Amino acid sequence: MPKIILPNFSTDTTARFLWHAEDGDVLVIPDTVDPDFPGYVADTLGIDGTSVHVERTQTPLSEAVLQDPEFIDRLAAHTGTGAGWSLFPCVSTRAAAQLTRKLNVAALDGYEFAMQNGIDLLNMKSTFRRLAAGLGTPLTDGVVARGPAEVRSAIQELIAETGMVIAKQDRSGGGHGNIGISTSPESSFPGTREVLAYANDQLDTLADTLWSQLTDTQNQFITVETYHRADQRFFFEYHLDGDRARFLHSSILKYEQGSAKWIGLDSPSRSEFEATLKPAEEFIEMIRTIGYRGYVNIDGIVLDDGRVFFHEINARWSGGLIYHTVAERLLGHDYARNNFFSSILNVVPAGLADLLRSLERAGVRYDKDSGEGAVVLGCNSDLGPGAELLVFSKDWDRLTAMKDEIATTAGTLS
Amino acid sequence: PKIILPNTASSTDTTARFLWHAEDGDVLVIPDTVDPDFPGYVADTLGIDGTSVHVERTQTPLSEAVLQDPEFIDRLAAHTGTGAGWSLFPCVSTRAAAQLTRKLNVAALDGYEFAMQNGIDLLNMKSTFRRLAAGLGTPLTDGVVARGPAEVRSAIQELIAETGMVIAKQDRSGGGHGNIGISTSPESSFPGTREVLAYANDQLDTLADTLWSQLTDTQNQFITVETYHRADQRFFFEYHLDGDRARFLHSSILKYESAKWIGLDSPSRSEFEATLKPAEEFIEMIRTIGYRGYVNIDGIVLDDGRVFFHEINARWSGGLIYHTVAERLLGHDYARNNFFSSILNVVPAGLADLLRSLERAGVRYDKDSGEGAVVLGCNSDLGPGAELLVFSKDWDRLTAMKDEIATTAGTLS
């Protein structure tokens, strides 16, 4: 039965991972949860909430925490001898693999890889560019820049094609540590903190600005790439074990209308066909071959001329893995054939009682008999600062309508 | 033809060894310096038209900056023309090397896109080898990819138990010197390391702090720390990787007497199923990743039969020139009926004087017998010294010949 849910990398941003829970499971959260939330999730999923436990840490789930003897003692009070227990971690770090040995739980898959912090290697943007260029995976023109002099020449070269370039921190997970560079006096860059103007004359000032903003002691690489305006954005998510890599779901990241803020996921993407699936399969099968075990997502784009490019991988939970998880649990493994889902990161925070009241006032609270409506993933999350909702429908236009009425009745943070 | 590219002088001839790669019409780029007789002698011994081979000198190492110098490009374009029938033969498939093939319109470097992302830099880190090795399942000694002084500290504590020996390695090092052994007992050896430090628990804090400071730099924020095993057999395998296959080239043994690298002997003694198969598996995955070119993998066999692999180097091994000479002088399956062995520390002397001592020893390379010695460098920074390479069909005979060279030409000690 039970696993330890471990999202390692009054706010309730980790509450959302309670939707992974089955009977006996433990959820570790670094923040708080609304104390009615676990019971409401158990009611919606049909599991016994009294057999689900929440263990609060007063701190993010760093490697130091996973090593902490006291923290280990609080988990061991659940796992006992370890028999029947597994660890379900967001990131297969060395401490996570260590944790499975100290609890005598089922050994982390890909243990030796994680013991060498293999997934740090995979979660670098330079590593993706290199592997993909070696494999032949569709990749934008770009450079693994090793200093600001390399940044200088790379901007000069790469700015020509589209008039737009993006420079990216080598390690993390989001469009915060990326900076756009644009030729046009405009700036429309989804997934960047800021856009700067190119300037042939002031080339060494720009390169310096980009170098010192995106590096540190541990990160002396920068990625510098030609940036394309995409018709379709998409990402694919997989689960890898010693047997296969299984496509789990395609989804779409939506941004608002320099710095487009991430506002939700739409899923069943519209980019499943051979020119995307099949190079992505080849690339994922190679990260499986080098030994990674766990969840991994690869994102990309399709241009209006049909060209496909893949931008990055992340060897960890996607932000959309839970959406797919509750979609599969409420609607069945087949749900993508006849269903659509979409998330709102943007609802005005309220307590769980008031959130559900507004979904009911709107007429769109999730209804098991139709399989349609909305569920709560967070009452007060930092994801898009606000309450997080997941909405289901068998018809895409009725989904859009539900989202309007939620926004109308629950409110949005503009 | 091809450009041979081993990527100031102090009057050394270290990279002259690569002349033995030459064929009719080839160009050889060198930093440092070479005896003007050395090309003709190598043409003489190899049986190629020496007036065809051209030698293009630069007074600085063949850095990335030199490879993207348009005046360096221009000197090369004098031999290449439109590019037709020419290729580049680089030691390290760097990004500039790949750029150079484009700017000379010569045949594209194999693995072009991978080189342009500096993928070779990724494979040539010991951290990368530990990670790929783990996870693929390749035998790997117990070790840690250390991220700070505190992790260096606990790594040494845990890892010291099994053997009483640990080795701390710079992430991008060039052989030993950059690798530091740590030992509970004073009489353990560590072939090829820089220092060997004492393990005393009451002083570990300082050990880890200073070990970190020695072995890191701005771009190297990893240290490797490994359980160190006493080995029966040492070996490395070299391969050539292209779009179709990984071809095993040779095995060889690095030789010592911490213990300095004195040379290497060929046919290794470690070519059996328990070695070849895991090496072939790892290397095939290197090929799948995209590396094209020469790659080698180091390993050890313990007395009990356990195999471990230590690192890979995606570049020419030091002994690829030896295997190349072996094939051209002795033929393609030489390793089945011949041995070879190199000497790195012979007393430096002019080519004329080195050949004369070889004749005086009675072991100057004799193409009628296939036996004897050729000169790879008269005064090189490898031993350091003059580098010879010696062939024989009989192992004990070759050992006798090496001793005659020692007497007659002298070595350093």
CATH of the domain at A297: 3.30.470.20
Structural contact between residues A146 and A207, judged by C-beta atoms closer than 8 angstroms: no
Classify residue A40 as left (phi > 0), alpha (psi -120 to 50) or beta: alpha
Q: Which two tokens stand for residue A375?
A: 């569920």
Determine, yes or no, domain membership for A136.
no
| Interchain pair B288, A286: CB under 8 A | yes
Which stretches does DSSP call E strand in B116-201?
143-146, 165-170, 179-183, 196-198
| Interchain pair B127, A135: CB under 8 A | no
Q: Which two tokens stand for residue B256?
A: 């010592």
Rounded Cα distance between A377 and A44, Å, is 12
Looking at the fold, whether B218 and B86 belong to one and the same domain comes out as no
Looking at the fold, whether B200 and B218 belong to one and the same domain comes out as yes
Q: How are beta strands B196-198 and B179-183 bridged, if at all?
A: parallel
* Cβ neighbours, 10 Å, residue B57: 13
- Residue ending a domain, choose from B227, B251, B281: B227
Compare CB distances from B290 to A110, A134, A292 and report the shortest one's residue.
A134
Residue type for position A114: A
Give one DSSP letter per residue of A314-356, joined into a string: ESS--TTHHHHHHHHHHH-TTGGGT-EEEEEEEEPP--HHHHH
Q: How many residues does chain A have?
A: 414
Rounded Cα distance between A337 and B305, Å, is 55
Measured between beta carbons, the chain B residues lying within 8 angstroms of A144 are 117-118
Report the run of H or E that residue B405 belongs to, with start and end: helix B395-409
Chain A nearest-CA residue for B132: A290
- If 0-12 CB within 10 Å is exposed, 13-18 middle and 19+ buried, where does residue B408 land? middle
Rounded Cα distance between A143 and B121, Å, is 13
Rounded Cα distance between A229 and A190, Å, is 9
Rounded Cα distance between A54 and A28, Å, is 6
- If 0-12 CB within 10 Å is exposed, 13-18 middle and 19+ buried, where does residue B185 land? exposed
Helices (H) and strands (E) in chain A, counts: 13, 18
Measured between beta carbons, the chain A residues lying within 8 angstroms of B147 are 117
Cα of B207 to nearest chain A Cα, Å: 22
Looking at the fold, whether A39 and A152 belong to one and the same domain comes out as no
Q: Which residue has the tokens 């007393």?
A: B347
Chain A nearest-CA residue for B111: A134
Structural contact between residues B324 and B266, judged by C-beta atoms closer than 8 angstroms: no
Looking at the fold, whether A208 and A289 belong to one and the same domain comes out as no
Q: Which two tokens stand for residue B106?
A: 């010569």
Determine, yes or no, domain membership for B98.
yes
Q: Is A379 helix (H, G, I), strand (E, B) or coil?
A: strand
Helices (H) and strands (E) in chain B, counts: 13, 17
| Interchain pair A126, B122: CB under 8 A | yes
Q: Is A397 helix (H, G, I), strand (E, B) or coil?
A: helix
Name beta bridge partners: A54: A27
| Interchain pair B118, A217: CB under 8 A | no
Give the count of domains, chain A. 3
* Cβ neighbours, 10 Å, residue B49: 10
| Interchain pair B135, A292: CB under 8 A | yes
Looking at the fold, whether A261 and A175 belong to one and the same domain comes out as no
| Interchain pair A127, B131: CB under 8 A | no
Nearby residues of B272 by Cβ (< 8 Å), 6 or more positions away: none
Classify residue B321 as left (phi > 0), alpha (psi -120 to 50) or beta: alpha
- Residue ending a domain, choose from B227, B258, B282: B227
Give one DSSP letter per residue of A216-230, joined into a string: -SS---EEEEE----
Residue type for position B96: A
Chain A nearest-CA residue for B125: A121
Cα of B290 to nearest chain A Cα, Å: 4
Rounded Cα distance between A406 and A323, Å, is 18
Provide the 8-state DSSP code for A171: B
Compare CB distances from B221 to A112, A118, A218 and report the shortest one's residue.
A218
Rounded Cα distance between A389 and A128, Å, is 32
Residue of A124, A413, A109, A367 whose CA lies nearest to A261: A413
Rounded Cα distance between B112 and B100, Å, is 11
Looking at the fold, whether B173 and B316 belong to one and the same domain comes out as no
Q: Is B10 helix (H, G, I), strand (E, B) or coil?
A: coil
Angle of helix B273-289 relative to helix A274-290, nearest 10 degrees, comes to 150
Looking at the fold, whether A356 and A327 belong to one and the same domain comes out as yes
Compare CB distances from B114 to A113, A134, A292 and report the shortest one's residue.
A134
> How far, CA to CA in Å, does A296 sit from each of A239, A287, A317, B85, B144?
7, 9, 7, 45, 24
Cα of B66 to nearest chain A Cα, Å: 15
CATH code: domain of residue B184? 3.30.1490
Task: List the determination method.
Answer: X-ray
Q: Which residues of B249-279 are buried (b: 16+ CB within 10 A; e: fewer)?
A: bbbbbbbbebeebbbbbbbbebeeeebeebb
Name beta bridge partners: A164: A182
Looking at the fold, whether A244 and A385 belong to one and the same domain comes out as yes
Looking at the fold, whether B240 and B377 belong to one and the same domain comes out as yes
Cα of B116 to nearest chain A Cα, Å: 8
Phi/psi for A320 (5° steps) reads: -100, 0
* Cβ neighbours, 10 Å, residue B347: 15
**Which residues from A are below 8 Å from B when comparing CB atoms?**
110, 112-113, 115-118, 121, 126-127, 129-131, 133-136, 139, 143-144, 146, 217-218, 220, 286, 289-292
Determine, yes or no, domain membership for A237.
yes
Residue of B320, B340, B345 whose CA lies nearest to B261: B345
Looking at the fold, whether B19 and B118 belong to one and the same domain comes out as yes
Chain B nearest-CA residue for A127: B122
Residue of B47, B52, B51, B103 whose CA lies nearest to B75: B103
Measured between beta carbons, the chain B residues lying within 8 angstroms of A294 are none
Looking at the fold, whether A216 and A254 belong to one and the same domain comes out as no
Rounded Cα distance between B354 and B331, Å, is 25
Q: Which two tokens stand for residue A190?
A: 């989804």
Provide the 8-state DSSP code for A367: B
Q: What is the dihedral of CA B403, B404, B409, B410, to 10 degrees?
A: 30
Rounded Cα distance between B250 and A287, Å, is 29
Compare CB distances from A113 to B113, B134, B288 and report the shortest one's residue.
B134
Looking at the fold, whether B304 and B403 belong to one and the same domain comes out as yes
Structural contact between residues B346 and B385, judged by C-beta atoms closer than 8 angstroms: yes
Structural contact between residues B343 and B263, judged by C-beta atoms closer than 8 angstroms: yes
**Which residues from B are below 8 Å from A when comparing CB atoms?**
111, 113-114, 116-119, 122, 127-128, 130-132, 134-137, 140, 143-145, 147, 218-219, 221, 285, 288-291
- Residue ending a domain, choose from B227, B245, B274: B227
Determine, yes or no, domain membership for A97.
yes
Rounded Cα distance between B76 and B92, Å, is 18
Mutate to test the interface with A, among B113, B154, B287 (most CBs of A within 10 A): B113
Measured between beta carbons, the chain A residues lying within 8 angstroms of B221 are 217-218, 220
Determine, yes or no, domain membership for B30.
yes
> How far, CA to CA in Å, does A404 sit from each of A323, A347, A354, A407, A408?
20, 11, 18, 5, 6
| Interchain pair A133, B145: CB under 8 A | no
Determine, yes or no, domain membership for B118.
yes
Rounded Cα distance between B300 and B308, Å, is 5
| Interchain pair B119, A130: CB under 8 A | yes
Report the run of H or E that residue A251 belongs to, with start and end: strand A245-251
Determine, yes or no, domain membership for B68.
yes
Q: Which two tokens stand for residue B5?
A: 């590219």
Determine, yes or no, domain membership for B185.
yes
Phi/psi for B362 (5° steps) reads: 75, 20
Rounded Cα distance between A29 and A11, Å, is 11
Q: How are beta strands B87-90 and B2-5 bridged, if at all?
A: parallel
Structural contact between residues A20 and A322, judged by C-beta atoms closer than 8 angstroms: yes
Which range marks the domain in which residue A169 is found?
141-226
| Interchain pair A291, B128: CB under 8 A | no
| Interchain pair B132, A217: CB under 8 A | no
